[model samples]
Target chain A: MDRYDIAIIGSGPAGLSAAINAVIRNKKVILFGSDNLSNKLLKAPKINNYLGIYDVSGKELKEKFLEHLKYMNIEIKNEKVNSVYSMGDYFALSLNQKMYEATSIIIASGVEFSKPLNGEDELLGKGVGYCATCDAPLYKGKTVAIVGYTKEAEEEANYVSELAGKLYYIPMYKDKVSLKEVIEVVEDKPISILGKDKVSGLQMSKGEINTDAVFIIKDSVSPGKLVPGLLMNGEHIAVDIDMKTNIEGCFAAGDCAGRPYQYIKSAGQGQIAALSAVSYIDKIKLN
Target chain B: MDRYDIAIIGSGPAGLSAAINAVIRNKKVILFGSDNLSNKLLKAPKINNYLGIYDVSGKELKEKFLEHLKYMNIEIKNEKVNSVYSMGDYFALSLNQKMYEATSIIIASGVEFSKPLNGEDELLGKGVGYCATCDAPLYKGKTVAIVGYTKEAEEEANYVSELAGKLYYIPMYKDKVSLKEVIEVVEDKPISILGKDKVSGLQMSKGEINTDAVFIIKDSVSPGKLVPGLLMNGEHIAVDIDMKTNIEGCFAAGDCAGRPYQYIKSAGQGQIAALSAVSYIDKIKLN
Candidate 1:
């Protein structure tokens, strides 16, 4: 666990931009995210308003971004950051079973498009959860449902199936499902969550499935859920012009900040956030 | 004097970005600045961190920007905006003798490199001034010193020479000087301003020139001087995340806004500013 000067979460334009700028200033940076980079940017058909590039396809633009990173000799860590814990002077970032340390952190995880189910917010702890693997033990010897939006969701469902008596895997996408034989892969569209006080069940387009708890997982989590006590504006993170969050030594950039979620805007904000983080680090060092 | 939906000042990446976005939104726009585009960006040998575009020369990047604009059928008006007057509902822009109207304005005028003379700030109104054409009448039948930084400054010198009894034109560049024969061209480097209650003379490296007023004209004007009552942070314009200035319906972006001063950052900010301006116009319409 090498302690880094700056650890950037997310590998999109915003995260990459922050890492590149921070690295240029001689800061040791560890960028965490998927190696394939931004799935949203890669899927874009054409991005015309990214300034200098002009009328470029998403694939070509991504290639150029990767090329620039390679030219700068910046590498990405292909591990997902589960959570970040603020510890006075520095931050402790948890990546599955392992942990990493950094003086400052920049969150450029982009925006989460998935909205919580009808009863998801109200019954969050009572009957609903986000991490199936984390909360699977609570539903041992009982039925539970897992709503997953990505392939990673299948893996979580498989892990939870091993512990839970009965597991219902609800796949949000039309992708081919792969899971344990005991894990039931349900392709029904989610309608809502049916519950009153404690653990109840989940309602789908096909029918209602009784469960002890429901776990909803997606590609990106909401700002508040991503970082405990982190202030949010609607679903996005609350940041100043310098990309500073309410939490000390924590900053966010890109689509996580706000609207008009353009690639150029994200990249620009990433640079600002990185510079601000650098300045903040220098100030703390002086103190 | 055609009224436009949005009037953008400058032809650099910021200005061009603003124009392209505004035009794409089907807003009537008038882009004001030089036809030659960004002189500073054009001279850069290599710019690597412009996001999507890998390692590119300044000249090549500029060409791409221009090509993007051309692809969108957006044209730049080769005229300098002298000043902007913010009315309650619309803005009145002054370009030489002509005045143009716009519902909103985006100031992407880049940055001003020329600093005020030593005593230039103290004797601003007393005798030292920036605009020769605006203050020429005050020096009628009086001697004046003109420190010209650009070719446009030479034109200002020729105009002021007609009103002033004696004029000393100080050229800051190696460009061939062409001015009225009555105006004496001084190639001496200006050291400081010599003044008491008013500008008495200009102290140069070689000798001193006795004059009633000293006119310091450069290519770009300060943010405060450029836009009346516009809030500024030091030499740069004070802008929020949306690139909105203190003035209503007036926005600023790029190097003119603040630090980092990267081409990508400026271009990104310009797009945000333009989009904000458009939203402002829509909100104003609803009212």
Candidate 2:
């Protein structure tokens, strides 16, 4: 089993934000790829009230997120997590074939939509950087090498590609991929992003080329899996202001945190997550 | 008369954070400044456990606070506020001949320090910032900063200046502002951050120069500057977890909110502030 100071389950707004902050504070953190809620922003054709910009795509907004991470360094791990259990002095997170541990943990795995699509479950952190803040920096001054189905995906691809000398949007059309901008929109069939241990590169239907990041767009609230004892209230995750879950050492945020999910609110909840973890940590510290 | 959503009496961690968050949230907020508790952190030898990083100065910590505002796009009137009062649906804040109003209010102005320093009362905001997180952004990519006194001021300044493209040490000495890195040492002697109309810059025994933002460190317990009929535990402004101050339309957070002045705790309180204000605003909306 691998151990870390904090194991964050979920790579959406809450998880990524917490991981970035924790890393800044010099805490060891691991972000396990599960489901992402920030992807829901794809449905938002335009966002105007988020403080800075007048209007931008969910993808562009995600690109701005990447700016937050350009100054710092933090690692990302992509894996379909299975379950999480708390043991003495550590929390155990079991993936498909491996286990990881942490002294503290933050459960930011947000909810997905209620729609359906292919390649949705398989692509997280590949083309699917849940946290635009952390991953945007990696693609800075570069173009979108590939794209996804929904507007969020397209927007993210567009946003990433804009920073570069040029960008490409490879969409999934009829199981075929089409390169955009320079390469031309040849096909819209879906393509595959393949890598092992870590995201090595992509293999979309349009063409195969090495790129920085890929974003996935699914039309569903894909909270298909749930941690044991974690409360579910409709499509949202049941949590108090302190980020408490039905079980201790568990919390949730972002779109799954309740109604009206926004970056401001999610960042606020990230603070709650840290505090809740600190409170729990202090309790154990006293013993 | 200018209307505001909140009128905070002191500019400390609680007041500044509350002001920053409220302003970004689109609520009009005003703050009062005092040196009675200013330079509180200047006494600390080193603060290595403030969550984000190890060791920081009270002054440089204050100057670098601009980061919180760079992207916030908030417009604040910098002035020495005199008093705060409520009238009808708006909160009233008096600065010189001008008055500002708002529908709701928050009193985060922290405690007054009992230490004696001549002319200390005159220098706030002009060259003194109280909260590190809120003001650190201001000093980003710039030198000419300072933080705590004793050993901590140097540390905080180092932290702030490290991020700044160019940084200098403003020790409380009468030494020349020589060497690009040396900001002059006015050590031991009391200094005042001075300005006219707005903060022109900070004043030292030798001279002064133009700068932006300041972090005022203090020690005395910030009194609960709440409305009549509200309750308090000594200096703390009493409130439920909902961030509801004793009076309607008023809220509180940070060191003054309760125990554990951790960033996470303060952020949790900020969320409570948003929720409480939203609920209150919704009720007003209903009317």
Candidate 3:
């Protein structure tokens, strides 16, 4: 496996700032995210308070960010990180079938803006999951439901359909579904997750469907599920002044940390997190 | 006196960012600082980690900041804020010859890079100060020393020379002395301040000069003397994530707040401070 000094997730202001600062500090960094960078920033009409730049449209700012990337010679890996495992001194990042190692990790994976189902968070671990590939074995020979937010979720639902006795895939987007005939596709919107000891059913806008498990596959996973055993503040990740999370060698910035959700704030935090990670790595080397 | 919703002290990244954000929130603001803005930023050869704008020189970034200000219709008052006093509900700001009122205050005056003389901070009110006009009356008919940082210090020293029986003006720069004929301009470098209960003399690299008082004027004043009774974390002002200071309705941001003095970090803190001040004003109005 290729090892790195730091691995940064997300390509928004927070992630980009972190990458630039870390690289400047002479740290070998692997930045993973989209080549196009932040959709949230690109969709913004006008960002009026990003420090030196004033009344700049999101697209214009993104162009400037790309220009900065070119100036710094930094490249984006453009891969989705499935999971991060903390293995004592280092972390193992699983991206599809590939695995990479890093001394420290900075999670700048912006915020998940979608609200959770009524009992979705409460029923997590009992039957609710974000990865169908990882949790499909648990519901083998039993009925399961998949609430997919994107086309990628369709791939995960197909992987789980072969294991589960019955599969119900609910499409959130307006795109046409193209799942196998073995899987029943539900077009109705899901309202909440219903269960007592475990996930018994999913309540939809039209009706409720009986299921043994619910797999919510979305573009961004909850910070807690993204990193097992990590602490959380409501739906966001809790971080200190230095952007350090409770887990050792792990830090978070930007919208994933908390409120106000301003672009300038996110970029500032990314810089701090990078510096803090550098200091943390230095201390480890000294020890 | 002109009253404002928010009064920002300093024209650096922190102060400028705060002013822009506050103005966007529809708050009346009066920004007090030099029209030239931050000399520190202007002097930077190149800044690579300010996020969106890549590989920009300090001078170019400053131009962008000024342009942003123009776009937002925010004008700087271009004056020095001598002191700020918290008066329960509102705050009072003392300028050189003018006073202004504001519901909230944000101090982003950056950091005093130079250390204070050994006994300078201890005898602040007793015989030391940053302002010659404010404390020159106390040294009337007595010998005094003026440690000037910039050319503006020359003007202040000339004012004190007429009031004191004997005046010693020490220039920190290599510029030609342009003060009153009565003022004995000393080219020697300042080392420390010497005193017991009050300022007795100023110790220099060459020799010590006996004086009744010492006015150690610089480009930036210490946060303690800048805002009377304000809390400090060593040399930096103590601030929360929201940028709120110990005193109600008085907040601080940028280098004055604490460490990791990056431009992006300062700008981010400024936005948070401005938003916090806005929320504070709203709460007060409700009551």
- The models' CA-based lDDT, in order, is 0.85, 0.54, 0.87
Q: Distance from true position, residue A216, model 3, in Å?
A: 3.2
Q: What is the DockQ of each candidate?
A: 0.60, 0.06, 0.66
Model 1 stretches astray by more than 4 angstroms: A118-144, A151-167, A173-187, A191-200, B118-145, B150-200, B211-215
Candidates 2 and 3 compared by DockQ, better number: 3
Report the C-alpha lDDT of model 3 over B1-287, residue by residue, as the tens digit. 56799999989999999999999999999998877788788779988989878667999999989999998999999777888888878889887678899999999999867677788768888888887887888879899999987677888887777878999999987869898888898889888888888889999889999989998777788778878999998989888767788998988988888889889988988888999999999999999
Q: Each model's TM-score, in the order given?
A: 0.86, 0.52, 0.86
Q: Of models 1 and 2, which has the larger TM-score?
A: 1
Cα lDDT, model 3, residue A286: 98
Query: In terms of lDDT, which candidate is stronger, 1 or 3?
Result: 3
Per-residue C-alpha lDDT of model 1 across residues B105-148, encoded as one tens digit per residue: 99998887777778977888899877788778887989999998
**Which tens-of-lDDT digit does each residue in A43-102 have in candidate 3?**
799888887776679999899898899889999997788789999999999866689999
Worst 10 contiguous positions by lDDT, candidate 2 chain B: B217-226
Which sections of candidate 3 miss by over 4 Å? A118-187, A193-203, A208-217, B122-127, B133-144, B151-168, B173-185, B194-201, B210-213
Alpha carbon lDDT of residue A182, candidate 1?
80
Models ranked on DockQ: 3, 1, 2
Worst 10 residues of 3 chain A by lDDT: A217-226
Decreasing TM-score order of the candidates: 3, 1, 2
Better of 1 and 2 by lDDT: 1
Worst 10 residues of 3 chain B by lDDT: B112-121
